[PDB]
């Protein structure tokens, strides 16, 4: 088969800047190279076909180039709506093959998270479990560290971290850290603290509550 290789798996660029996404074929494929964009909801859209031809509703910012073995999709001036994963596709003849995709992120002005802490609900507690949630809202860049302290002591076990996709409108991220304990474990301690470390400050943003409600 014809191996399609994309230059990089992820790319981050600022609004207004020129962006290039590269693709390479293991043999000469002439002009038979297509570019698709996939959104986080899984929707797939054809942007460029036959190396350089734009498709339906595709903005003039997009252009395509190709040598037969090396190809690129170029965005002249990056816009907010350009977020997604870009795949190349050769269709010389069966079997068709695809590049593995380049995920395009918007590079944004740095933004500090807004931090919220959520004690377990009475509903969960009465059923024997206890989850404590630390939520970090609307920050950039994506890289962020959450540290849990229970009665002053670090806990790493039973912690689950997850991020949103980059916000389609303002390019920020949000994330939650969930600490799972049993009710009995949870009732054996008083102080619950999450500390968020982000590049926007050298001092952690700290949120706590006491199980005593005081």
């Amino acid at each position: 088969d014809i191996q399609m290789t994309q230059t990089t798996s992820s790319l981050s660029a600022s609004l207004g800047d020129r962006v290039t996404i590269g693709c390479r074929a293991s043999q000469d494929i002439g002009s038979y190279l297509n570019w698709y964009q996939q959104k986080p909801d899984g929707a797939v859209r054809l942007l460029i076909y036959y190396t350089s031809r734009l498709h339906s509703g595709v903005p003039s910012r997009f252009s395509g180039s190709g040598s037969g073995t090396h190809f690129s999709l170029t965005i002249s001036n990056l816009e907010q709506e350009d977020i997604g994963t870009y795949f190349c596709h050769q269709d010389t003849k069966p079997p068709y093959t695809f590049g593995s995709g380049t995920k395009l992120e918007i590079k944004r002005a740095d933004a500090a998270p807004t931090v919220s802490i959520f004690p377990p609900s009475s509903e969960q507690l009465t059923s024997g479990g206890a989850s404590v949630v630390c939520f970090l809202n609307n920050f950039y860049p994506k890289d962020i560290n959450v540290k849990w302290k229970i009665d002053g002591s670090e806990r790493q076990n039973g912690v689950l971290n997850s991020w949103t996709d980059q916000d389609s409108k303002d390019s920020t991220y949000s994330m939650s850290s969930t600490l799972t304990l049993t009710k009995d474990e949870y009732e054996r301690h008083n102080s619950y603290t999450c500390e968020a470390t982000h590049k926007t400050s050298t001092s952690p943003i700290v949120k706590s509550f006491n199980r005593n409600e005081c």
Partner: peptide
């Protein structure tokens, strides 16, 4: 899934907005 509410603690600082949620487990 089991679903649990995410509700601000009793001793939480107020403000013009509030963040609420649902934990899906």
């Amino acid at each position: 899934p089991s679903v649990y509410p995410l509700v601000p603690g009793c001793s939480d600082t107020s403000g013009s907005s509030v963040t609420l949620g649902c934990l899906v487990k």
